[model samples]
Target: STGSATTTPIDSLDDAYITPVQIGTPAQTLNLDFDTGSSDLWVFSSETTASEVDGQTIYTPSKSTTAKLLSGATWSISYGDGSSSSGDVYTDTVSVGGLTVTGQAVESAKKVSSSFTEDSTIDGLLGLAFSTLNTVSPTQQKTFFDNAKASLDSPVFTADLGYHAPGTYNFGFIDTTAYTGSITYTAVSTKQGFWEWTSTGYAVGSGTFKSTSIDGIADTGTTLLYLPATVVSAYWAQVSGAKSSSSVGGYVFPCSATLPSFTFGVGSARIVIPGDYIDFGPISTGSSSCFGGIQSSAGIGINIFGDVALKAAFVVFNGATTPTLGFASK
Candidate 1:
């Protein structure tokens, strides 16, 4: 989502991805990506060489008297997109919302990629998705949530995704305003670090794909929902004015027209993606509008419910009790 500083309509899966942690004070508020898949909270520092630190939020440690460095430990990280960063380790008193955790470990990247340097809006990522994919060692395994959980009012965390909306990431205690029914939860797999789940089957516009209907996993790390071509094409056909737009990454949609709502059957619960979420935002060039949430990544072999899809509902990752995901209201 930090690429090019341009808006791209992500799937519901991608939209749901967010980390809500406060950096600095009210005057210099910095909310960040709470990625569960990784550890080590990092922010761009003011002392960072501009050429080496790109597309990342530069934090001024000097501005905060409480910041402390780890001295000799060096850190480096690589992403799936082949982007990487390297820097020194540091510790500081950090606050998320009203909850404050003292002596929390963080990374100050000295060298970053252009994709991160160009995006001045993003302060940094607050890795909170899951602990399995963490790059830090067991001795250094510390996450923003892990350190702040004790001081949190509920000791439990909830995420509300308002993808592309005014306030996309809402964290802290679970928001009960949106819960209309009993919360359904799925047991988490014993996978290493990924929050993977097995699906019973899949459907496109109420029609199940016999061949493609197999056990699938829901991943937040992935950006889009990768479904079979047959399933994606079939669902798009149900939209009244849905048409493929090249500018919008080749997902079917009538940019100016309303599309029908579709539901994804997850066990007894049917996750519905509304029309507004489907017709998201316009691409930068204005050639074609990107679907707020669409199905792409066919033949990619996995189904990812990215941030876009996750934002519509409140998700609870209950690792303390067991590896499970509970869906509730914001």
Candidate 2:
């Protein structure tokens, strides 16, 4: 067995956000969002027409020493937000965290939206989460981990998020300091492209709670934990000073108060969320304080455990070993 590597705690929201991979040899700098939900390495290019390009950060190959175009091949992407971009193909060497990989395929969007074009901080997205979702078929290449696995110090990777702050997500290493014990491994279900696992039960505060025997899916793409309305209401009812603020659209509680702690039992592994996380503030709609960790998504059928749930443990998706997911602590 390989020894664990250093782990860093990151805010769940910023878990996978990292500096953009510099494309080409001389390194054309671009900021990128590291996403696990999809598999694709995309970037904004100089060829992007001003009309199609909206609020996204665009990379100019002319400024870099090693950038090159890929002829007539064109690329376009539609995200969950209903926004999309289209551009020509480009081949370049990309670098992330000081590590460089040669011959990376990227799509330079000729058309993009203002939402993406306006964000100068972000150049594009680097989908390093999985290879199974790769848009490119036939060849079936690994995103980054799959391509650089040999050079990585370890087979394991860990993502530590800091909520509002930019969290540190590392590859080829596990931050043992962030976890409590050995990771409990679970087999991945191919039926859903998303990584799924079953939890034994869940508890809020010291109150007795009903255990729902259901499988939970971890999706970095999602922002919050979508739970059954019944569970969401029940959890908040027990929280002291917890009240529903119409402005927040959920229950709001005092941040300084000792918020109720919830624990989900995943086999022998127990993941806990601190009370502070329960103090969700106003975002839109109503101006009330609500439970931070869990939210109501009554009709959504599938319960999605998003970044809020991931912050509690060190998650590892071992695609190399039959699409398995392992959870550990520091």
Candidate 3:
């Protein structure tokens, strides 16, 4: 079996990607962020405090006859951005696109951080990372992908994220028409419970490629692309009036400055992020200081190829025998 779903960006900045997911008997269709950075299918639910509900949708497990509480099971998760959520666990019938899985662990959120409360665009998250990253306790839970992989025609999923537009998330098979050129397959290191891989090199627009190995995770949950300080500095240096501003918390420049495109290698293939994407946007309404989409990975420890990078290509999260990753231009 296979499934296909449309993933739409929450805002013009492409802050996060949300996809509609059906959970429980009557189908509580909630818009969830499809996060490849973590593993745990959690949702805003009836258990959540009304104060935190805001305008977001909630999944009411008690209203579904097929929903069963996983007694003694609980889950809590923290993101790199310092946002967190905790909840009780429930097993229910869950569906994404056309694929359905019975007895899927649907974590019901009871507590959430202020950042989550302020963000009304997403109801919760559908984690697509390795199951090892699942935060469920007592009885560890498998992610929706883990449970549905067996029934799928192939153990893989493809992400075709768009820039300021709607894209697709396809399970089981790669959509050849979704990408241009041949896919470059590379080995993935799941030790970190992420879609971690190494890029062969990088080049700052029209510049010579720097032969260096940059290891990073392809995280759809994150908004920006983070690389080594050395790499980031090189890219920003090419832009006039660019400066690393502590007040703004990243490299910022004049909105009118001409920015250079960033190119990274995936095996022998190269994926280029347009200069406009690298410029990001102004610091605030009508501000001339623009923040950069690419930043240094100093505090984060590991580099992150987030939406800024992934949106430039068609990414395949292959969970087949060898567990490889594939990238192709689109």
lDDT for each candidate structure: 0.56, 0.63, 0.93
Superposed by TM-score, candidate 3 places the C-alpha of residue 235 at a distance from the truth, in angstroms, of 0.2
Tens-digit lDDT track for model 3 on 1-330?
999999999998888899999999899999999999999999999999889888899999889999999999999999999999999999999999899999999999999999999989899999999999999998889989999999999999999999999999999888999999999999999999999999999999999998899999999999999999999999999998999999999999999998889999999889999988776788999999999999999999999999999999999999986788899999
For model 3, what is the alpha-carbon lDDT of residue 190?
95
Instruction: Name the 10 consecutive residues with the lowest summed lDDT in model 3.
Output: 273-282
What ranges in model 1 sit over 4 Å off?
1-28, 52-57, 137-139, 150-155, 167-172, 200-223, 228-230, 239-252, 289-292, 298-301
| Candidate 1: residue 138 Cα off by (Å) | 8.9
Worst 10 residues of 2 by lDDT: 1-10
A best-first ranking of the candidates according to their lDDT comes to 3, 2, 1
Tens-place lDDT digits, model 1, residues 33-129:
5555456577777766777654544677767667776777676777644666667776777765546667777677777777667655555666665
- Model 2, span 282-314: residue lDDT tens: 443364443466777655667776766766667
lDDT (Cα) of model 3: 0.93
Residue 6, model 2: Cα distance from true site in angstroms: 12
If both were scored by TM-score, which would come out higher, candidate 1 or candidate 3?
3
Model 3, residue pairs in steric clash: none
